[PDB]
């Protein structure tokens, strides 16, 4: 195991997070998911988990 910072991990996994957000209807499309992630809304962290 290794500990990875939230800010770093989010930027590395951005595309996976966007896909998962789109699937769970937190964002309407890819641009919406990317904009949501760039603002780092509270719902992004649960998806990243």
């Amino acid at each position: 195991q290794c500990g990875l910072p939230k800010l770093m991990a989010l930027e590395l996994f951005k595309p996976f997070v966007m896909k998962r957000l789109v699937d769970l209807n937190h964002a309407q499309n890819i641009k919406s998911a990317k904009r949501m992630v760039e603002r780092q809304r509270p719902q992004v962290w649960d998806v990243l988990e």
Binding site: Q28, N29, I30, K31, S32
Partner: protein, 77 residues
Amino acid sequence: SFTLLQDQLQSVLETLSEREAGVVRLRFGLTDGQPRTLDEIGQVYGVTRERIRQIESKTMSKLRHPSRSQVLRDYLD
């Protein structure tokens, strides 16, 4: 995302309107690539210039409806 537009804006809204959007495919050249004037898309069939002029406004009003309008909001900056 542009390709996803070819999946949404180009396709689904056309399936639910038949020729009301089939003419639009010729209007902006979604097929064969040529945007076409009212006469060109009308002269080959039995529909006049003014009728296509009315149909374009009717389609614009139809697609302004919130149910269709809300979906495409994210594809425009």
